[PDB]
Amino acid sequence: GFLDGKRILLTGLLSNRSIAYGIAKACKREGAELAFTYVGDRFKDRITEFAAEFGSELVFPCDVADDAQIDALFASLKTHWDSLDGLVHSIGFAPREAIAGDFLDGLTRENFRIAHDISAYSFPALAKAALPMLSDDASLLTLSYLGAERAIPNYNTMGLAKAALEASVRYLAVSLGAKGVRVNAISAGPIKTLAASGIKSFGKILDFVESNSPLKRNVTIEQVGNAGAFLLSDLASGVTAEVMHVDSGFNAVVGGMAGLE
Amino acid sequence: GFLDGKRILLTGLLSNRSIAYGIAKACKREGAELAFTYVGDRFKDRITEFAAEFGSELVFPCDVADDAQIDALFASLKTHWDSLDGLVHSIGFAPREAIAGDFLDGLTRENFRIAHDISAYSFPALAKAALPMLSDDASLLTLSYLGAERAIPNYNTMGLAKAALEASVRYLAVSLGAKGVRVNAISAGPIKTLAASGIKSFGKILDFVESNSPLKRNVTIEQVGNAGAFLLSDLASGVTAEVMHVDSGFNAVVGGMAGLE
Amino acid sequence: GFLDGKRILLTGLLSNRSIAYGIAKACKREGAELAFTYVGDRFKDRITEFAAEFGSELVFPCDVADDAQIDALFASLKTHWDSLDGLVHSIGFAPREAIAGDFLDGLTRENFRIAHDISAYSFPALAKAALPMLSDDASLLTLSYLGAERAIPNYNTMGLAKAALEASVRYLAVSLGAKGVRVNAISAGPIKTLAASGIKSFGKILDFVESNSPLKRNVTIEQVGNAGAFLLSDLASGVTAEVMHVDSGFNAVVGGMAGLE
Amino acid sequence: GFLDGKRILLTGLLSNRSIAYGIAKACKREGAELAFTYVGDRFKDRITEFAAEFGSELVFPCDVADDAQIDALFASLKTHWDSLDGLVHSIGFAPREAIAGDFLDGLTRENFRIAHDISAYSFPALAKAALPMLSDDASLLTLSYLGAERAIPNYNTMGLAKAALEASVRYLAVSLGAKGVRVNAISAGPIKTLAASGIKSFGKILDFVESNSPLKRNVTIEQVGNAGAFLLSDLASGVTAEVMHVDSGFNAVVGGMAGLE
Ligand SMILES: NC(=O)c1ccc[n+]([C@@H]2O[C@H](COP(=O)([O-])OP(=O)(O)OC[C@H]3O[C@@H](n4cnc5c(N)ncnc54)[C@H](O)[C@@H]3O)[C@@H](O)[C@H]2O)c1
Ligand SMILES: NC(=O)c1ccc[n+]([C@@H]2O[C@H](COP(=O)([O-])OP(=O)(O)OC[C@H]3O[C@@H](n4cnc5c(N)ncnc54)[C@H](O)[C@@H]3O)[C@@H](O)[C@H]2O)c1
Ligand SMILES: NC(=O)c1ccc[n+]([C@@H]2O[C@H](COP(=O)([O-])OP(=O)(O)OC[C@H]3O[C@@H](n4cnc5c(N)ncnc54)[C@H](O)[C@@H]3O)[C@@H](O)[C@H]2O)c1
Ligand SMILES: NC(=O)c1ccc[n+]([C@@H]2O[C@H](COP(=O)([O-])OP(=O)(O)OC[C@H]3O[C@@H](n4cnc5c(N)ncnc54)[C@H](O)[C@@H]3O)[C@@H](O)[C@H]2O)c1
Ligand SMILES: CCc1cc(O)c(Oc2ccccc2[N+](=O)[O-])cc1F
Ligand SMILES: CCc1cc(O)c(Oc2ccccc2[N+](=O)[O-])cc1F
Ligand SMILES: CCc1cc(O)c(Oc2ccccc2[N+](=O)[O-])cc1F
Ligand SMILES: CCc1cc(O)c(Oc2ccccc2[N+](=O)[O-])cc1F
């Protein structure tokens, strides 16, 4: 397909319901060669299997809290791939209390720190670490959420982190653009994933979106994935510094103002 | 490719440098069946040829100033196509003085009217007229410009018109979304086209973008086209009500603040 | 107060519940000298009284559909005021069907035209007509609504018109800024006014905002008015081309995603 | 004036050119009672003097890196003021290399951390710490910059930090709004201040803004201050979760596309 020959590294493939699984599946379909990261030796087995069902045996540990692992990841990858065409950043984290209840109740310096460190800093950090082996027409993708633009209940500290994440997309696009590398994000709609379990009221959000988005339907990892593959391909070569919504248009409306119909 | 079987109507193919030419070329490449509109019997010959080099003999007059022609277009098309999968709105107009010099000097009620009528109203108007023969997973595309979001010199009345155009994308996405039809826009960067001749300082804008966009390069009708084809395809089924920038990221920076280096 | 000596013309004072009434009241309070417009000889009596309770006897007919009345308004005003410090644009209109039910059902070329003509074009048109007697530090205010930014049910064609209105703010700010005149808008929240009667589901919107805005309360013409007076004063001299929300922060959240609590 | 009786705490008054100095001066003028913070015992003398020229003897150390000082600040203030009506957050920091040259060259985990910790986290942290003594109609103000919205040369890591700062405004507005407290920001234009010295190319930016903003002029701490006082007053009671530009409209244009005139 439109990603033949492209070599792409995917982070954040945790289960068969992960957004990164859908992106991987679309990229593979379009002819990319894939490689994967995992967090912690315990998960090496599960990820090696995932990579195998995508025709890949390239897996590398990367806890983004750890500078050593970030540098090692790309030293390791470089032994297998001379150059890297795509990077998918599809990871994040915030302590329970930082994404539950009131925004201030759950706010601490450490909660703020961790959330921004893992969910925002890790993207340009991965970009920097990958730069030497990035090809000139490389493309970097990250995943964001509407909670960066507007206040969403329980999203809280992540919203702050995502807004910084979206800003890093713009600074990264400038910093890497002379060379030719593009940098974008997808602002995905609610998808039932493992991470989604940390958002109490996710089911409520999910229902609301289904009811109120222009398409009257929620998105899938296939849809987010197909847009992933697009942004990562040369079809999207005129596109950088862009936060693309894949949320059935939910971002663009003001919904739920029917009154107990 | 990813538009096999899709039947798509393109407006605004005036020359081999038109944005609509690039979109057509990408769609054809991806396996779409195409049909075209032209303005005025004089141009029937030139467009019939364009359609022929895309493997199509379906051409239909449509001056969007004229309700009769809008209704006739889709009565005519319906005799050849049972259903319509894609509509490309790539047209517009504003009187010379409305896009030259000071915004107020060139402002008149008629200039305002014409500009909005042709450049903004015609999109949902085409959408409405096409609705009966639109398939459920149809996709409608229009072209906008950064002048809708921020004041650009000489763009003037068009900026107002484009902002209304971008709003119509959102209302159209809601209005047609229950049925399943998606509605989006591409905010394209400066491209040397016939319409571009109406913008004095286009060459200056073109230079500035090349110099200051993250990618340090201007876009092409191929790049805008590839993103067209994407939005029009099922790869973009999670995407509606979206204004997608295809401008090498220019929208996202504040450029040219080097001082006589 | 902070508008002493300022001479300000207000449009759109229809009743004691009009947004323009609140703006007038705040400006008067802050020491402005006021003048008013009315639509149609029938309403001359009601407006002359309103002006009297603001200490003013300056009233002038202005149907913004009519170029003659726009030019006459400022010829007339010029006989009483040597110079103009403030202009409040607080007017608009769209045919019933254009702001009811589905966006496409109510869409016609004439409905589009009228809506944009009265609600959007009239602002820069008033600005142009007023320019000769505008003082260098003059300030122009218009009123918009969140329906310009995001699709709101029933708002429909007005949303398109408001988006053009908000764009005209930016082009006007550039066009009049060298001279020193500022141009801004207030994106007001839902307020029970005569115009509000044209929006079926206004009560529903009103309830939703009260329930879901950060302040858990709706705004008043006093609040919109106080922000009016601010923007019109020299306190706001660093501010132009700005769309300021006065809506208890409603614009900035994603509300109502509680599920049948 | 319009802040009589209000008791307001100001952070970030470092010199007579600080933005916080201008805000203080406007608030005092409008009848507020003021109190100030300073960083480090060395600066106690300079700030005690500043407070004295505003009729205040209330000064309190607060290095926002330090949880102990944040809690102590409001224990101390509470001994003098029963309740707090206003808080001005006008502080920040990023290591030299984090705001110089390329965005990636200067990027480190620690640089990211410090920048976000001091420039973004400290605002809601101050809000939380102040909450018990905040009155119901209290108002909190922070200062941001256009670098949060679009990539600006050399702004780099601060841009990320400011975007998180602006998001915290929205989450804080929701979290504190039921009680009635408002939370806003001013996105100020370039002003020659001590902090400005950390931005090489500040003079270039300053020149560009003067040349290209709609008002053809830069802003002052008086202008930012007057808008401060506004947001902090009951005139702005309909306004929360708002990022208000005070930058002569620079944000709203695309400037400098004249070509070597
Ligand atoms: N699911 C949604 O509704 C939704 C919507 C919009 C955006 N997103 C975003 O998409 C991305 C993926 O999340 P998801 O929905 O696929 O759920 P997920 O749980 O499947 O993926 C989360 C990933 O975060 C990774 N991760 C956590 N801490 C890490 C660390 N220290 N180092 C490396 N990786 C770490 C996990 O390993 C996991 O793969 C996230 O950035 C998330 O914010 C999700
Ligand atoms: N070229 C650029 O720099 C640029 C950038 C962003 C957006 N756009 C937009 O892309 C679209 C296409 O313009 P272009 O750049 O391809 O130049 P173009 O001249 O090739 O296309 C303009 C089209 O407008 C059509 N048109 C004018 N009046 C019409 C009417 N009454 N009825 C039907 N069609 C009419 C013309 O026939 C022509 O096909 C426009 O909407 C334009 O605003 C252009
Ligand atoms: N009330 C709300 O909820 C709300 C919210 C946001 C914005 N707005 C806007 O505020 C402005 C004022 O409306 P309102 O709420 O005060 O209701 P309103 O009915 O009191 O004011 C409407 C005004 O429109 C004027 N008008 C209509 N046609 C006109 C014409 N051809 N020429 C001159 N004037 C004409 C009317 O005379 C009337 O004064 C409008 O622009 C409206 O869109 C209202
Ligand atoms: N000057 C500009 O061009 C401009 C433009 C937009 C926004 N801003 C913002 O306005 C705010 C004020 O900066 P400024 O322009 O007045 O310059 P400034 O140097 O006068 O103010 C900076 C302040 O940061 C304070 N600060 C630094 N580290 C601190 C810490 N650990 N704890 C407490 N305070 C600390 C300093 O004490 C100083 O008062 C900043 O947030 C800045 O980002 C400035
Ligand atoms: C409500 C939408 C949503 C957004 C996320 O960023 C998301 O992913 C996370 C949520 C909380 C903490 C960390 C993550 N994450 O994987 O980045 C899950 C979701 F369901
Ligand atoms: C500066 C970028 C630009 C934007 C357009 O919308 C554009 O197209 C038009 C310009 C003026 C009037 C009408 C059109 N148009 O074809 O819609 C051409 C351009 F060069
Ligand atoms: C839902 C909020 C709202 C917005 C308006 O612009 C408004 O004013 C109008 C509504 C429809 C047509 C015309 C106007 N108007 O006075 O401009 C009334 C409202 F209640
Ligand atoms: C270019 C405009 C500008 C923005 C700032 O946030 C600014 O303030 C800082 C700049 C760098 C680091 C820290 C600060 N700060 O005081 O928050 C100074 C500026 F000149």
If DSSP states are collapsed to H, E and C, what string results for D39-78?
Answer: CCHHHHHHHHHHHHCCCCCCEEECCCCCHHHHHHHHHHHH
CA distance A144 to A158: 10
DSSP string computed for chain D: -TTTT-EEEE----STTSHHHHHHHHHHHTT-EEEEEESSGGGHHHHHHHHHTTT---EEE--TT-HHHHHHHHHHHHHH-S-EEEEEE------GGGGSS-TTTT--HHHHHHHHIIIIIHHHHHHHHHGGGEEEEEEEEEEE-GGGTSB-TTTTHHHHHHHHHHHHHHHHHHHHHTTT-EEEEEEEPP---TGGGGSTTHHHHHHHHHHHSTTSS---HHHHHHHHHHHHSGGGTT--S-EEEESTTGGGB--------
**Cβ–Cβ of B167/C172 closer than 8 Å?**
no
Measured in angstroms, the CA of D77 and the nearest CA of chain B are apart by 42
Lookup: tokens for A140: 């970097």
Question: Which technique was the structure solved with, according to the deposited record?
Answer: X-ray
Closest ligand 2 atom to Cα of B20: 16
Q: Would you say B91 is a known binding-site residue? A: yes
Lookup: tokens for B148: 């809708």
Please enumerate in sequence order all residues whose Cβ is within 8 A of that of D23, keeping only pairs 6 or more positions apart, or say none: D10, D88, D90, D141, D221, D224, D225, D228, D229
Distances (CA, A) of B38 to A61, B189, B195: 58, 24, 15
Burial per residue of B60-97, b for 16 or more beta-carbon CB atoms within 10 angstroms, e otherwise: bbbbbeeeebbeebbebbeeebeebbbbbbbbbbbbee
Lookup: tokens for A58: 């390239």
Measured in angstroms, the CA of C178 and the nearest CA of chain B are apart by 11
CA distance A38 to A30: 23
* B90 interfaces chain A, CB cutoff of 8 Å: no
Phi, then psi, of A13 in degrees rounded to 5: -85, 100
Closest ligand 7 atom to Cα of C155: 1
Closest ligand 3 atom to Cα of C202: 3
Phi, then psi, of C141 in degrees rounded to 5: -120, 140
Burial of B57 (0-12, 13-18, 19+ CB in 10 A): exposed
Burial of C68 (0-12, 13-18, 19+ CB in 10 A): exposed
Q: Would you say B64 is a known binding-site residue? A: yes
Q: Angle B74-B65-C110 (CA atoms, 0-180°, nearest 5)?
A: 100
DSSP three-state, residue B143: strand
For residue C261, what is the domain's CATH number? Answer: 3.40.50.720
CB of residue B118 inside a 6 A radius of ligand 2? yes
C195 CA to centre of ligand 7 in angstroms = 5
Neighbour count for residue C46 (Cβ, 10 Å)? 13
Distances (CA, A) of C7 to A41, B188, C24, C83, C181: 74, 44, 11, 8, 14
Amino acid identity of residue A30, one-letter, is: E
Please enumerate in sequence order all residues whose Cβ is within 8 A of that of B8, keeping only pairs 6 or more positions apart, or say none: B27, B32, B33, B34, B35, B84, B85, B86, B87, B88, B232
User: How many alpha carbons lie under 13 Å from residue B122 in its C-beta half-sphere?
Assistant: 28
CA distance B145 to B62: 23
B182 CA to centre of ligand 1 in angstroms = 28
User: How many alpha carbons lie under 13 Å from residue A180 in its C-beta half-sphere?
Assistant: 9
What CA dihedral angle connects B129, B130, B132 and B136, to 10 degrees?
A: -140
User: How many alpha carbons lie under 13 Å from residue C96 in its C-beta half-sphere?
Assistant: 1
Burial per residue of D152-172, b for 16 or more beta-carbon CB atoms within 10 angstroms, e otherwise: bbbbbbbbbbbbbbbbbbbbb
* A257 interfaces chain C, CB cutoff of 8 Å: yes
Which residues form the domain of D197?
1-261
Neighbours of chain A (3+ CB pairs under 8 A): B, C, D
The CA R_g of chain A, rounded to the nearest whole Å, is: 18
SS3 content of chain B, % helix, strand, coil (to 5): 45, 15, 35
Element (H, E) at C20: helix C19-29
Annotated binding-site members of A for NAD(+):
12, 18-19, 63-64, 91, 162, 191-195
**Cβ–Cβ of D259/B214 closer than 8 Å?**
no
> Which chain A residue has the Cα nearest residue B230?
A230
What resolution in angstrom units was achieved for this structure?
2.5
Closest CA to C173 of C141, C133, C135, C144: C141
- Going by alpha carbons, the residue nearest to atom 19 of ligand 7 is C196
Token pair 């119901």 is found at D136
Distances (CA, A) of C73 to C28, C58, D195: 21, 11, 50
**Cβ–Cβ of B164/C125 closer than 8 Å?**
no
**Is C103:C156 a contact under the CB 8 Å cutoff?**
yes
**Is A240:B215 a contact under the CB 8 Å cutoff?**
yes
CA distance A259 to B4: 43
Q: Using the 8-state DSSP alphabet, how is residue B165 labeled?
A: H
* β-strand partners of B88: B10, B141
Neighbours of chain D (3+ CB pairs under 8 A): A, B, C
What CA dihedral angle connects B20, B22, B23 and B29, to 10 degrees?
A: 140
Closest CA to B232 of B164, B106, B135: B135
Beta strand B182-188 pairing with B243-246: parallel
Point out the ligand nearest to the CA of residue D96: 8
**Cβ–Cβ of A128/D104 closer than 8 Å?**
yes
Show which residues of A are catalytic.
Answer: 145, 155
**B131 closest CB neighbour out of C104, C109, C171:** C104
DSSP three-state, residue B182: strand
CA distance A188 to C6: 50
* β-strand partners of D36: D10, D59
**Is A115:A93 a contact under the CB 8 Å cutoff?**
yes
> Which chain A residue has the Cα nearest residue C156?
A253
Dmax (CA) for chain A in angstroms is: 62
**A254 closest CB neighbour out of C152, C207, C258:** C152
Distances (CA, A) of A137 to A231, B153, B215, C203: 12, 32, 10, 53
Phi, then psi, of A215 in degrees rounded to 5: -85, -5
Burial of A189 (0-12, 13-18, 19+ CB in 10 A): buried
* B69 interfaces chain C, CB cutoff of 8 Å: no
Q: Would you say B56 is a known binding-site residue? A: no
Measured in angstroms, the CA of B121 and the nearest CA of chain C are apart by 7
Phi, then psi, of B190 in degrees rounded to 5: -60, 125
Catalytic residue among C21, C38, C121, C145: C145
Is residue D171 annotated as part of the catalytic site, yes or no? Answer: no
Neighbour count for residue C83 (Cβ, 10 Å)? 12
Please enumerate in sequence order all residues whose Cβ is within 8 A of that of A20, keeping only pairs 6 or more positions apart, or say none: A10, A11, A12, A13, A14, A88, A90
Closest CA to B255 of B219, B208, B188, B185: B208
Q: Would you say B100 is a known binding-site residue? A: no
Catalytic residue among D21, D38, D121, D145: D145
Surface of B (153-172) touching C: CB under 8 A: 153, 156, 159-164, 166-168, 170-172
**Cβ–Cβ of D213/C239 closer than 8 Å?**
no
Distances (CA, A) of A1 to A27, A103, B10: 9, 45, 25
Lookup: tokens for C163: 């988006």
> Which chain C residue has the Cα nearest residue B127?
C104
Length of chain D measured in residues = 261
Distances (CA, A) of B166 to B138, B147, D67: 19, 11, 47
C242 CA to centre of ligand 7 in angstroms = 20
Closest CA to B111 of C176, C98, C128, C148: C128
* B112 interfaces chain C, CB cutoff of 8 Å: yes
Lookup: tokens for B212: 């200051």
**Cβ–Cβ of A174/B220 closer than 8 Å?**
no
Token pair 């008002």 is found at D215
Token pair 């950088």 is found at A240
D114 CA to centre of ligand 4 in angstroms = 14
Token pair 């507005």 is found at D173
Q: Which residues of D touch C213 (CB under 8 A)?
A: 177
Phi, then psi, of C203 in degrees rounded to 5: -60, -35
Lookup: tokens for D97: 């290399």
Closest CA to B253 of D251, D89, D54, C140: D251
DSSP three-state, residue C112: helix
Neighbour count for residue A83 (Cβ, 10 Å)? 12
Q: Which residues of D touch C183 (CB under 8 A)?
A: 214
Amino acid identity of residue C4, one-letter, is: D
B93 CA to centre of ligand 2 in angstroms = 7
**Is D37:D7 a contact under the CB 8 Å cutoff?**
no
DSSP three-state, residue B35: strand
Beta strand B59-61 pairing with B33-38: parallel
Token pair 């971002």 is found at A251
**Sheet with A182-188, side-by-side order of all strands:** A59-61, A33-38, A7-10, A84-89, A134-144, A182-188, A243-246
DSSP three-state, residue B54: coil
CA distance C189 to C247: 4
**Is A166:D163 a contact under the CB 8 Å cutoff?**
yes
CA distance C64 to C8: 18
- Going by alpha carbons, the residue nearest to atom 11 of ligand 1 is A90
DSSP three-state, residue C31: coil
Dmax (CA) for chain B in angstroms is: 62
Burial of A68 (0-12, 13-18, 19+ CB in 10 A): exposed
**A244 closest CB neighbour out of B226, B244, B252:** B244
> Which chain B residue has the Cα nearest residue D254?
B152
Phi, then psi, of D139 in degrees rounded to 5: -135, 135
Closest CA to A50 of A60, A63, A36, A69: A36
> Which chain B residue has the Cα nearest residue A187?
B239
CB of residue C202 inside a 6 A radius of ligand 7? yes
The CA R_g of chain D, rounded to the nearest whole Å, is: 18
**Is B88:B141 a contact under the CB 8 Å cutoff?**
yes
Q: Using the 8-state DSSP alphabet, how is residue C71 labeled?
A: H
CB of residue D165 inside a 6 A radius of ligand 4? no
**Cβ–Cβ of C172/B104 closer than 8 Å?**
yes
DSSP three-state, residue B148: helix
* B57 interfaces chain D, CB cutoff of 8 Å: no
> Which chain D residue has the Cα nearest residue A147?
D167
CA distance D133 to D78: 7
DSSP three-state, residue C35: strand
Q: Count up the domains in chain D and report the number.
A: 1
Token pair 């998918």 is found at A88
Choose, out of C200, C207, C257, the residue to mutate when testing the contact with A (most A CBs < 10 Å). C257
Q: Angle C47-C50-C52 (CA atoms, 0-180°, nearest 5)?
A: 110
C86 CA to centre of ligand 3 in angstroms = 18
**Is D22:D54 a contact under the CB 8 Å cutoff?**
no
- Pocket perturbation via mutation, ligand 2, pick of B21, B157, B193 by most ligand atoms within 8 A of CB: B193
Burial of A260 (0-12, 13-18, 19+ CB in 10 A): exposed
Beta strand B7-10 pairing with A243-246: unpaired
DSSP three-state, residue B161: helix
CB of residue B145 inside a 6 A radius of ligand 2? yes
Lookup: tokens for C159: 């949303």
CA distance A175 to B173: 35
Phi, then psi, of D206 in degrees rounded to 5: -55, -45
Measured between its terminal Cα atoms, the distance across chain B in Å is 47
Nearest-10 crossing angle of helices A157-177, A122-130 = 20
CA distance C8 to C18: 17
Phi, then psi, of C32 in degrees rounded to 5: -75, 155
DSSP three-state, residue B244: strand
Closest CA to B191 of B240, B247, B233, B139: B247
DSSP string computed for chain A: -TTTT-EEEE----STTSHHHHHHHHHHHTT-EEEEEESSGGGHHHHHHHHHTTT---EEE--TT-HHHHHHHHHHHHHH-S-EEEEEE------GGGGSS-TTTT--HHHHHHHHIIIIIHHHHHHHHHGGGEEEEEEEEEEE-GGGTSB-TTTTHHHHHHHHHHHHHHHHHHHHHTTT-EEEEEEEPP---TGGGGSTTHHHHHHHHHHHSTTSS---HHHHHHHHHHHHSGGGTT--S-EEEESTTGGGB--------
**Is B13:B24 a contact under the CB 8 Å cutoff?**
yes
B239 CA to centre of ligand 8 in angstroms = 37
DSSP three-state, residue B79: helix
**Cβ–Cβ of A152/C256 closer than 8 Å?**
no
**Is A143:A19 a contact under the CB 8 Å cutoff?**
yes
